[PDB]
Amino acid sequence: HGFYIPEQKYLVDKIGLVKYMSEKIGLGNICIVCNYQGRTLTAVRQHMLAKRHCKIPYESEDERLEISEFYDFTSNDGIELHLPTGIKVGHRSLQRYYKQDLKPEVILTEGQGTLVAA
């Protein structure tokens, strides 16, 4: 089916992350993703196999707040962005301004400079 338990590293209650998921398809009979309500265990079951949702989304930031207990978590300017290491990273709109190399600073000799000041 494709059922995957996010951060297998961090789980306390993982035997109870099984009980909260079987309460979605167990009683109220709900899909883990859709909100689709089957009438029977068959319904929610037949469907999970249908549009193919076996995955409990970790990407939704309200979904990390819902399933939070059964995990144990242990201890844009438009131009450049500011990283924690000191980095200034560029943007994909300027990609051809980056790639373009330009003229070096034009630097006079003590011979050429001297003659130009005089």
């Binding site: 494709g2 995957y4 549009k51 193919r52 990407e59 450049e80 990283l83 980095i87 994909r92 980056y98």
Partner: protein
């Protein structure tokens, strides 16, 4: 028969903006095997040590596919335009920044 693809998430990860956990959480769910998602038949392997991500599959799959699901996960988390997917050598790919300044 097995083909194995390798991506290096080191550059963006170490600098604070990236999580190979979620990246390897995404790939697993969004690969399409002879059909819809979640169908990896022990025909597709996504595992990672945190500085790299491994991809190994007997099922239909490609270099371009890995690039497509890569770019799509970034725009979702808006790391697009701050990160670009390049090929270091054939079938081993690296994630990088455009401009790097101190």
């Amino acid at each position: 028969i097995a083909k194995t693809f390798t991506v290096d998430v080191s550059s963006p990860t170490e600098n604070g903006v990236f999580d190979p956990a979620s990246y390897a959480k995404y790939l697993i769910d969004h690969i399409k095997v002879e059909g819809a998602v979640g169908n990896l038949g022990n025909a597709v392997t996504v595992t990672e040590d945190g500085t790299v991500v491994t991809v190994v599959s007997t099922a239909k799959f490609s270099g371009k596919y890995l690039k497509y699901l890569t770019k799509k996960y970034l725009k979702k988390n808006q790391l697009r335009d701050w990160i670009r997917f390049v090929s270091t050598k054939t079938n081993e790919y690296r994630l990088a920044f455009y401009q790097v300044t101190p």
